[PDB]
Design a protein around this ligand. Structure first.
Ligand SMILES: [Co+2]
Ligand SMILES: [Co+2]
Ligand SMILES: [F-]
Length: 328
């Protein structure tokens, strides 16, 4: 009877089922959806699009997503609850800080940040009573001084609550190694940590080094590719030039090296996106019309056809998220 908190309340761990561990309803900024909803057409249009997309994922077998939007990604837990209910897909919300914190966060101490993360896990987000079930943190290269405090505060909040920590990295810069060192300096167990965007690199020395230490490896950008769009500089910079099959081969590469229990798979998809160039959501929807159904529709069959046993795929998509999310 282990439980996880969702935007609709507590659920049994065993009901999470097929879980995408790094997703977003909307990638935005604090206050932005409230102040400028017309950027997304309207709030109603954004919610309707998210409901359609989540229903499509559900039809393809997805039962839960972890929306890793923090305060500074503009997380709107009321929107999450509305779309979760309408689409019948569980959504786990996040606390933490990504790489766009405002001054009122950047000026805070490790102790103050710990209190904020604990508020969102133990009390509730804003005035809603909805509790976060994961802590999201970020570096983009070597940690800034402030990011070091964020990572330490995340470790402290995790140790106090059992909730896991998940990260954004610049994978080509091997950020996960420094992240791990900071977390371990606070006594955090690697089994509570997912080093994300790890499919942005093919450096298996880096990835197996983390997996060997007990970290979860987040292969979470499966549909990201600018192949065919190389003349679009903004798409090229965000999506890269590696195909989805190349990204998916990393799942098999880690399985083949003994690390099936250390893999989490996701898309890093969204239904609105205001923190990048205007039009980016349209580019993305053309790349991947299947949205959050892409992993079950394309990635899982690709792996099965390469010989990965169904039981292993179920372990990656069901058992690993359940172990990760269960407070421990
Ligand atoms: Co990220
Ligand atoms: Co993300
Ligand atoms: F992301």
């Amino acid at each position: 009877g282990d439980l996880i908190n969702t935007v609709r309340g507590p659920i049994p761990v065993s009901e999470a089922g097929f879980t995408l561990t790094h997703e977003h309803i909307c990638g935005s900024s604090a206050g932005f959806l409230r102040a400028w909803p017309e950027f997304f057409g309207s709030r109603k249009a954004l919610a309707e699009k998210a409901v359609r997309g989540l229903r499509h994922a559900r039809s393809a077998g997805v039962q839960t997503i972890v929306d890793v939007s923090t305060f500074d990604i503009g997380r709107d837990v009321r929107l999450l609850a509305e779309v979760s209910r309408a689409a019948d897909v569980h959504i786990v919300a996040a606390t933490g800080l990504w790489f766009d914190p405002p001054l009122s966060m950047r000026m805070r101490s490790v102790e103050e940040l710990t209190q904020f993360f604990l508020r969102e896990i133990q009390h509730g987000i804003e005035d809603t009573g909805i509790r976060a079930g994961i802590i999201k943190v970020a570096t983009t290269g070597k940690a800034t001084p402030f990011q070091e405090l964020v990572l330490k505060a995340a470790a402290r909040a995790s140790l106090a609550t059992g909730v896991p920590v998940t990260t954004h990295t610049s994978a080509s810069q091997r950020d996960g190694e420094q992240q791990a060192a900071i977390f371990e300096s606070e006594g955090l167990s690697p089994s509570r940590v997912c080093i994300g965007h790890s499919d942005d690199t093919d450096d298996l020395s880096y990835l197996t080094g983390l997996a060997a230490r007990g970290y979860l490896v987040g292969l979470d950008r499966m549909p990201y590719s600018a192949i065919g769009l190389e003349g679009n500089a903004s798409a090229l910079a965000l999506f890269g030039t590696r195909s989805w099959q190349t990204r998916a081969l990393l799942i098999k590469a880690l399985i083949d090296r003994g690390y099936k229990d250390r893999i989490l798979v996701s898309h890093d998809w969204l239904f609105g996106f205001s923190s990048y160039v205007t039009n980016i959501m349209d580019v993305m929807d053309r790349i991947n019309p299947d949205g959050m159904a892409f992993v079950p529709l394309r990635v899982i069959p690709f792996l099965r056809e390469k010989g990965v046993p169904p039981e292993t795929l179920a372990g990656v998509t069901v058992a690993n998220p359940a172990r990760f999310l269960s407070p421990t």
